[PDB]
Coordinates of C-alpha atoms and ligand atoms in Angstrom, one line a residue:
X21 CA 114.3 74.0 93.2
X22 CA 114.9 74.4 97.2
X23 CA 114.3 71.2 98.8
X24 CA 113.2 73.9 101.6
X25 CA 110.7 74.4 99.5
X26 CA 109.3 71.0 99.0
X27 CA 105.9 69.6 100.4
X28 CA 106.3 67.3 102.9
X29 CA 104.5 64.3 104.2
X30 CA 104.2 63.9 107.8
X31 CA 102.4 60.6 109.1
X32 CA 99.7 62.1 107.3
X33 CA 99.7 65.9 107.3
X34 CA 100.3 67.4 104.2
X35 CA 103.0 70.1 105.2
X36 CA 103.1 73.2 101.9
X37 CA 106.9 72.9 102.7
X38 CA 109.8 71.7 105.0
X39 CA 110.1 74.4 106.7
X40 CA 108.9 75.1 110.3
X41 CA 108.2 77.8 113.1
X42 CA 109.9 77.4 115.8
X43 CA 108.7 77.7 119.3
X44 CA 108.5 81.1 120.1
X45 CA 107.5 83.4 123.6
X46 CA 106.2 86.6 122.8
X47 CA 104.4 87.2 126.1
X48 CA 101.3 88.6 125.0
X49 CA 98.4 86.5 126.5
X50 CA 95.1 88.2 127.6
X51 CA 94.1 88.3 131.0
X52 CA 94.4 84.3 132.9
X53 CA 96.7 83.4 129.9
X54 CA 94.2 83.3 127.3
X55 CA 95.3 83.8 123.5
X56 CA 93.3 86.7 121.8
X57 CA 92.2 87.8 118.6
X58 CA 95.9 89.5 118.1
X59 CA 97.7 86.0 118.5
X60 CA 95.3 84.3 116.2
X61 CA 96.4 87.0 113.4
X62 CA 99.8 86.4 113.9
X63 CA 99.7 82.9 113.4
X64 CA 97.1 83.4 110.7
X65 CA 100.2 85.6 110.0
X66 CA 102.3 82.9 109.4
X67 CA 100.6 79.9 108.3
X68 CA 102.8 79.3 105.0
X69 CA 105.3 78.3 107.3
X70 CA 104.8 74.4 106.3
X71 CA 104.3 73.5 110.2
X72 CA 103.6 75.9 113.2
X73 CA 105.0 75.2 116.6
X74 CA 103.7 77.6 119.0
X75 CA 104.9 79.3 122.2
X76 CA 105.8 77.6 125.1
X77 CA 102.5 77.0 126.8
X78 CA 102.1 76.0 130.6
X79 CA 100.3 73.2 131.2
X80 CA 99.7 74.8 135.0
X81 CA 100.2 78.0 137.0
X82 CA 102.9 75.7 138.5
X83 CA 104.5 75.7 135.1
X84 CA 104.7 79.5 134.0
X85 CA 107.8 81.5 134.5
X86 CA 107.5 84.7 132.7
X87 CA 104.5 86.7 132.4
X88 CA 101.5 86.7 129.7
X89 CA 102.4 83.3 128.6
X90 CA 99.6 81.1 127.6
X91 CA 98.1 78.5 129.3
X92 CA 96.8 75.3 128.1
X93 CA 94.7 74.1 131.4
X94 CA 91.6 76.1 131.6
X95 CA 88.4 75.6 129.5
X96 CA 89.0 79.7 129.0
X97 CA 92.1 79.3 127.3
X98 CA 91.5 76.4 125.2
X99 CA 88.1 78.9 124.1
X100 CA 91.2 81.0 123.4
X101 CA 93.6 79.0 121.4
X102 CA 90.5 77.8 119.1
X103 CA 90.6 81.7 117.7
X104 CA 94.4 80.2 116.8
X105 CA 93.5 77.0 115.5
X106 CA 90.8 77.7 113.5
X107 CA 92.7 80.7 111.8
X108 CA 95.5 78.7 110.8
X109 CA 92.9 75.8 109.7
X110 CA 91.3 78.5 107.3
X111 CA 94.8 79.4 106.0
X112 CA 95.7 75.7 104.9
X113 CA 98.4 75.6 108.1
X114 CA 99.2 72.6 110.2
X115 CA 100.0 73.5 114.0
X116 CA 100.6 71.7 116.7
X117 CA 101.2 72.8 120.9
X118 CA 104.7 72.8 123.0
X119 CA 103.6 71.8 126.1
X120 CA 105.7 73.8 128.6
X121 CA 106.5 73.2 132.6
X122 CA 109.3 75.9 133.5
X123 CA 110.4 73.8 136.0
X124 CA 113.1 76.3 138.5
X125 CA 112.9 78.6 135.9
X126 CA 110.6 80.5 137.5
X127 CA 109.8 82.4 141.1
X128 CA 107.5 82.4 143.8
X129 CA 105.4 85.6 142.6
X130 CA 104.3 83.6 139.9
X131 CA 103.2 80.5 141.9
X132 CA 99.8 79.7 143.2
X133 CA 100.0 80.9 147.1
X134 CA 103.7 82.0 146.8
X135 CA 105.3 78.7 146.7
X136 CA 108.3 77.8 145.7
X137 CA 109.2 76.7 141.6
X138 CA 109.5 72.7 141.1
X139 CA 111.9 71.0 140.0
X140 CA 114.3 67.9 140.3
X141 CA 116.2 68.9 143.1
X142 CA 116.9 72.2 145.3
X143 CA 119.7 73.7 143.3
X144 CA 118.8 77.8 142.3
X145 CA 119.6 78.6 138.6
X146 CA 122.1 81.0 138.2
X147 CA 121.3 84.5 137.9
X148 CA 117.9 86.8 138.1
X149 CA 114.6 86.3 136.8
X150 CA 112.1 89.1 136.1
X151 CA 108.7 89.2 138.3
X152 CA 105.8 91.4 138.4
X153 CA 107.8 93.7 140.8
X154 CA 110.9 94.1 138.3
X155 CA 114.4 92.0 138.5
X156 CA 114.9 89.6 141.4
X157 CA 117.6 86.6 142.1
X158 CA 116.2 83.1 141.4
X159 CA 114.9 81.4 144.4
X160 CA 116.1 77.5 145.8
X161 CA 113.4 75.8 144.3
X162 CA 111.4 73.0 146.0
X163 CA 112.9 69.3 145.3
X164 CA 109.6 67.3 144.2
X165 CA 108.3 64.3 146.5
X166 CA 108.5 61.1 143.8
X167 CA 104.8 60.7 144.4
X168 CA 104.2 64.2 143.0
X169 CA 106.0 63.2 139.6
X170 CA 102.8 61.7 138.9
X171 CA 100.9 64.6 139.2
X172 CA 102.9 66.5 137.0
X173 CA 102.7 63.7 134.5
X174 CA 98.7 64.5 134.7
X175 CA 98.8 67.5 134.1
X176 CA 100.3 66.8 130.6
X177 CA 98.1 64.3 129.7
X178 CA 95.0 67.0 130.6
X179 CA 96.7 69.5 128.7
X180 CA 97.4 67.0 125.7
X181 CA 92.8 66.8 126.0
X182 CA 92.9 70.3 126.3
X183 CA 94.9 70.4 123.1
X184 CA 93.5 68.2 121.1
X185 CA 90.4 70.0 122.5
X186 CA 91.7 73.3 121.0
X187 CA 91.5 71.4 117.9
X188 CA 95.6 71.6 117.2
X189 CA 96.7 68.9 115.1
X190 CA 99.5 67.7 117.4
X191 CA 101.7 68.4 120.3
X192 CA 105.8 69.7 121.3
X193 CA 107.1 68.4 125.1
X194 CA 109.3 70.9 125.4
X195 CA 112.1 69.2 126.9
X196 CA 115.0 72.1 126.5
X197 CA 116.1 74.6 127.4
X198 CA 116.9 74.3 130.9
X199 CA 113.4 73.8 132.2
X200 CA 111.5 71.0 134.1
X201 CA 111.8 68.1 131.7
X202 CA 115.3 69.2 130.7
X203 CA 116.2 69.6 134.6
X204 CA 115.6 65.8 134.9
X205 CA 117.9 64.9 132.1
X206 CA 120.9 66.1 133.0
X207 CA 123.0 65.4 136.4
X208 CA 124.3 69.1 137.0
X209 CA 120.6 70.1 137.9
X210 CA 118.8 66.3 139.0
X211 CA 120.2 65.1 141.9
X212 CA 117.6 62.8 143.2
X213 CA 118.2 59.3 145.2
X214 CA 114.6 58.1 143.8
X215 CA 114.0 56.2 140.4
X216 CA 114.2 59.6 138.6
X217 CA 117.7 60.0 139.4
X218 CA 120.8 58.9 139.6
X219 CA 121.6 56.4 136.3
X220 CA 120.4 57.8 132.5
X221 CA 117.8 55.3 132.4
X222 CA 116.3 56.8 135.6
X223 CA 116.6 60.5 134.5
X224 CA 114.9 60.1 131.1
X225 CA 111.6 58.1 132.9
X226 CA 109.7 61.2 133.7
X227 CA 110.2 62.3 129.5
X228 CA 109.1 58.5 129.1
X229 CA 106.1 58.6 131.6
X230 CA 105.1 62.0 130.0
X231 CA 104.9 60.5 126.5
X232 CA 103.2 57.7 127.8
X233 CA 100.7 59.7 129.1
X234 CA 100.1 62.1 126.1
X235 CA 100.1 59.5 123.8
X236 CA 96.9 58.0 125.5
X237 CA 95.0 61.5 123.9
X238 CA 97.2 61.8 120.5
X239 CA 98.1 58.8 118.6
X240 CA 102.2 58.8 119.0
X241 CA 102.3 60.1 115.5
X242 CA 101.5 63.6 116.5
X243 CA 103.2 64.0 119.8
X244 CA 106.8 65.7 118.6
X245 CA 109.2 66.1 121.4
X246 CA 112.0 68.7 121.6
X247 CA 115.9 68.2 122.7
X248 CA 118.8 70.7 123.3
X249 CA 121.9 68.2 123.5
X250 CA 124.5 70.6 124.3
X251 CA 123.6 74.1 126.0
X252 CA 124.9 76.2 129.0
X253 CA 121.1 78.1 129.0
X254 CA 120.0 78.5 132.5
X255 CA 122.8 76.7 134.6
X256 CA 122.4 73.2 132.3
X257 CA 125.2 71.0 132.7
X258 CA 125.5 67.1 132.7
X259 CA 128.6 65.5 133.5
X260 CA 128.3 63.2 130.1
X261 CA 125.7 64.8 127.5
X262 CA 126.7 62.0 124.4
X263 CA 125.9 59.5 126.4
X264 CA 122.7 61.1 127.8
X265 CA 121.4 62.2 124.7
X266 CA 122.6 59.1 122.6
X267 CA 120.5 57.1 125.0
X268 CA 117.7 59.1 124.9
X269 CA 117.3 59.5 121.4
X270 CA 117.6 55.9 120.5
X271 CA 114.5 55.0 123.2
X272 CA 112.6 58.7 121.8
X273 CA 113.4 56.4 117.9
X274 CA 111.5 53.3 118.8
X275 CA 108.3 55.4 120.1
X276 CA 107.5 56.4 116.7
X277 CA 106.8 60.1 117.4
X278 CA 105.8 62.8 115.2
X279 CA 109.4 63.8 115.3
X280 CA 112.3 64.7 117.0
X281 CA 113.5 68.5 117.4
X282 CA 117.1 69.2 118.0
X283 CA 118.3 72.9 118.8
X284 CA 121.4 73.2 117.8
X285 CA 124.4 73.8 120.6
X286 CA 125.4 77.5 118.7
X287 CA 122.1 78.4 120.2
X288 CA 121.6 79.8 124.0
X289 CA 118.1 79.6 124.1
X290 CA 117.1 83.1 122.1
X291 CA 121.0 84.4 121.7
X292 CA 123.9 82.7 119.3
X293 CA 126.9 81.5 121.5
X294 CA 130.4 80.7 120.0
X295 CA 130.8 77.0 120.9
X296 CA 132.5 74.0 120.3
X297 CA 130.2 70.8 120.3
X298 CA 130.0 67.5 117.6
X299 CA 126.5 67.1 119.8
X300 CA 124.8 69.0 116.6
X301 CA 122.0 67.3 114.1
X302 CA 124.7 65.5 112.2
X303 CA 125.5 63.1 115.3
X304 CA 122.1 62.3 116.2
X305 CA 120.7 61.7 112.9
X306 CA 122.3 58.3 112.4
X307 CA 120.4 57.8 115.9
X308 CA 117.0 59.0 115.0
X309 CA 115.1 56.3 112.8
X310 CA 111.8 58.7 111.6
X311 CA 111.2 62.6 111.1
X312 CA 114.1 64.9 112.1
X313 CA 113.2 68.7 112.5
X314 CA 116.7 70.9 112.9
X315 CA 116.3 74.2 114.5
X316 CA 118.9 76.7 115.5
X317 CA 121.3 80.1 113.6
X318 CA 120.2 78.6 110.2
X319 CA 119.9 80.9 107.3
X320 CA 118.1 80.1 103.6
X321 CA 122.1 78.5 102.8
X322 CA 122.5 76.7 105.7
X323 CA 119.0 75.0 105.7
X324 CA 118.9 74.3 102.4
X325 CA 122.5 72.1 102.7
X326 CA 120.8 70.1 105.7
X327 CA 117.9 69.5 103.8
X328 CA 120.2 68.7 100.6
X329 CA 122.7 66.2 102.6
X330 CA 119.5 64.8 104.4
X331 CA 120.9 65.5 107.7
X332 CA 117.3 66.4 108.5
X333 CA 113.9 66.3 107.2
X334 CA 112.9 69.5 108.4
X335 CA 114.2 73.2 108.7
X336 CA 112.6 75.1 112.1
X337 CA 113.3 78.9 111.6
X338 CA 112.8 81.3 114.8
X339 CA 113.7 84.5 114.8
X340 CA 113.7 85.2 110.7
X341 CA 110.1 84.3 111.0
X342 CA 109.1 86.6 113.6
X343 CA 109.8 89.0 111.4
X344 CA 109.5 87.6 108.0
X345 CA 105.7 85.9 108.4
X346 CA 106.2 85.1 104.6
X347 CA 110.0 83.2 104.9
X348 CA 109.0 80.7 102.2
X349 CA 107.9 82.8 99.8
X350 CA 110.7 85.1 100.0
X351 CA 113.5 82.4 100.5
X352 CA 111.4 80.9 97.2
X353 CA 111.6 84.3 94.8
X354 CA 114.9 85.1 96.3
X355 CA 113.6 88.6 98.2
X356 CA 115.6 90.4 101.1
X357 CA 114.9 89.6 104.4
X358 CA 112.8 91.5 106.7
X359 CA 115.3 92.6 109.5
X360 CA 114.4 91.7 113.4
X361 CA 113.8 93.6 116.2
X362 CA 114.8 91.9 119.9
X363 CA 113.4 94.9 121.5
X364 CA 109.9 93.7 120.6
X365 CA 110.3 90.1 120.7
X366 CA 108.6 90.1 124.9
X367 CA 105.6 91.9 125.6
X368 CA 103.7 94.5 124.1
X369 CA 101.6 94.9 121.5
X370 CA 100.7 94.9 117.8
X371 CA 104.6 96.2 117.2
X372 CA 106.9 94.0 116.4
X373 CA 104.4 91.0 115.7
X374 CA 102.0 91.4 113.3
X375 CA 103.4 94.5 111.3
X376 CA 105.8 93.0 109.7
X377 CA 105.4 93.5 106.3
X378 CA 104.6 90.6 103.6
X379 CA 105.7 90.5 99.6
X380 CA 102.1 90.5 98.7
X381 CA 99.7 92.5 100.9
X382 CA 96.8 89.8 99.9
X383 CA 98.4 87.6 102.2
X384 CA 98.7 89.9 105.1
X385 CA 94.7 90.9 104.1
X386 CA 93.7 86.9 104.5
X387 CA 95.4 86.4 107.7
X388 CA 93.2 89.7 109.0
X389 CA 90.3 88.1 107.8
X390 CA 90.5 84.8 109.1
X391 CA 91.6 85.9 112.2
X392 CA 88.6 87.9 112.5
X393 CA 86.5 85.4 111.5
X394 CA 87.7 83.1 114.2
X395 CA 87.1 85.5 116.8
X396 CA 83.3 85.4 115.6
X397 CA 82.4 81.7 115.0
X398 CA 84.4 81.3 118.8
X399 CA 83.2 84.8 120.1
Ligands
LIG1 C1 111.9 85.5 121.4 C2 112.2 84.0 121.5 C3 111.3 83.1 122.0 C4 111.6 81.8 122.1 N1 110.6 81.0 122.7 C5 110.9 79.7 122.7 C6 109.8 78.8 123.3 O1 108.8 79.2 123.7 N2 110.1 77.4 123.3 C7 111.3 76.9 122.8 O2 111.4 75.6 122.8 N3 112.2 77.7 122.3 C8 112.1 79.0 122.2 N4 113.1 79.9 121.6 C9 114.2 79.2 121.0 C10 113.9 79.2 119.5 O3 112.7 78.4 119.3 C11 115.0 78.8 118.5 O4 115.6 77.6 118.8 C12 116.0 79.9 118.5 O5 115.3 81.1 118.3 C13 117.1 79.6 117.5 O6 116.4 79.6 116.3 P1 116.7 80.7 115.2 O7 118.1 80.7 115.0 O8 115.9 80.4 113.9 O9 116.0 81.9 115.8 C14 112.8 81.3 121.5 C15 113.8 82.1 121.0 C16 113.5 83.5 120.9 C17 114.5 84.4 120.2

């Protein structure tokens, strides 16, 4: 009897429920950002979760800001991801890639030669960014030439073939969260002369040219993009966010996409905020014609009443499902909650990813043993 609960149709893919994992970094590639055995259990993990998005993936060096992030643009570490694919295949699971560019957020120790991060314009986020030599202060980053917009927009569309490559059955522009795309959107951060900046039209055409250019390697059906409408994450401001976002979501309606994901605004990135915004899933869905996917401080309760007043069509669930890999089976027989640990959410190991204990072992025993048989039939 939870509509959470209930299989749902999307274009096509047969989701087990409508309910979703979030995006999630967890900084634990292999060496040159390649996924391992390890991340194919976890999501083997997880694969009752009626749709998988995964972690933030760059779609370049360019694009990484944080260390042992995968990568999405060499033929190594789509080898990598088809451990992941496969294992959720095996497991019934439906999974698709957020393609990520960090934009500013980012520093030159990660960069190819030791060049500066990308982004709009040459405004430094606020703040300090951890590097492979501990805690620095964010860098000015380096205000892109409008012919290198293009090149950016290319290296989506490879990692879209890379993707589809990979064999995932669709694709997340991460556009939120304070990084590249997001950058663009609003006018605190973009403050570019070109035809990228200035009016909303002109901010939202690199999100536009992006899609375009994925949706030359998906069909449009399975490229999903994601919003934050409201947020202070990373030195985001715009001096008018309803009418940005109202704008943008009415264009995003008529490119019949997968989907739309909103965050909602009590959500900082990883951390809950106290805030006051009507910018939450209620004010866009009368904006958004096809599949609406909410994300953000939801529990079984409050998913269940979005579901139930149809304010969306999906429930995206972050942080309970890194430590609860069955959510839907225990939201569906009414178990406690798993509890979850920040300290382990960034780095490391085993701990804090795929111990997390299931209500039935047998499930915990089949992700282990797809997830070792991926690693063999992609050794
Ligand atoms: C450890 C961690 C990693 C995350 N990684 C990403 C990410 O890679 N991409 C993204 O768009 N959002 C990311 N988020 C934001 C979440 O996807 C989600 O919006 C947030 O956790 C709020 O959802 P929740 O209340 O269910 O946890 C992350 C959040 C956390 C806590």
């Amino acid at each position: 009897m939870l509509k959470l609960l209930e299989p749902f149709d999307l274009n096509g893919l047969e989701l087990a429920n409508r309910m979703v994992m979030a995006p999630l970094t967890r900084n634990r590639a292999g060496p040159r950002f390649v996924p391992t055995k390890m991340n194919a259990l976890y999501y083997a993990q997880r694969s009752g979760l009626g749709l998988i998005i995964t972690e933030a993936t760059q779609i370049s060096q360019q694009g990484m800001g944080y260390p042992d992030t995968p990568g999405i643009y060499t033929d190594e570490q789509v080898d990598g991801w088809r451990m992941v694919t496969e294992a959720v295949h095996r497991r019934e699971g439906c999974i698709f890639l957020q393609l990520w560019h960090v934009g500013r957020v980012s520093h030159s120790s990660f960069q190819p030669n030791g060049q500066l991060p990308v982004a709009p314009s040459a405004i430094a986020p606020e703040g300090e960014v951890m590097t492979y030599d501990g805690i620095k202060p964010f860098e000015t980053p380096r205000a892109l030439e409008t012919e290198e917009v293009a090149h950016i927009v290319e290296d989506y569309r490879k990692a879209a073939i890379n993707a589809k490559r990979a064999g995932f059955d669709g694709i997340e522009i991460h556009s939120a969260n304070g990084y590249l795309l997001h950058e663009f959107l609003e006018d605190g951060t973009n403050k570019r002369t070109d035809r990228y900046g200035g009016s909303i039209e002109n901010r939202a055409r690199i999100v536009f040219e992006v899609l375009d250019a994925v949706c030359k390697v998906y069909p449009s059906r399975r490229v999903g993009i994601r919003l934050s409408p409201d947020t202070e994450f990373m030195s985001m401001s715009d001096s008018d966010r309803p009418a940005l976002y109202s704008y943008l979501v009415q264009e995003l309606s008529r490119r019949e996409l997968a989907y739309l994901h909103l965050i909602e605004p009590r959500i900082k990135g990883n951390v809950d905020v106290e805030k006051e915004s009507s910018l939450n899933v209620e004010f866009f869905r009368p904006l958004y014609k096809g599949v609406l996917i909410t994300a953000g401080g939801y529990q079984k309760e409050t998913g269940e009443e979005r579901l139930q007043k149809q304010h969306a069509d999906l429930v995206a669930y972050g942080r309970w499902v890194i430590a609860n890999p069955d959510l839907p089976s225990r939201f569906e027989q009414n178990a406690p909650l798993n509890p979850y640990d920040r300290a382990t959410f960034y780095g490391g190991n085993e701990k804090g990813y795929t111990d997390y204990p299931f209500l039935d072992p047998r499930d915990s025993q089949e992700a282990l043993k797809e997830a070792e048989a991926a690693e063999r039939k992609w050794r």
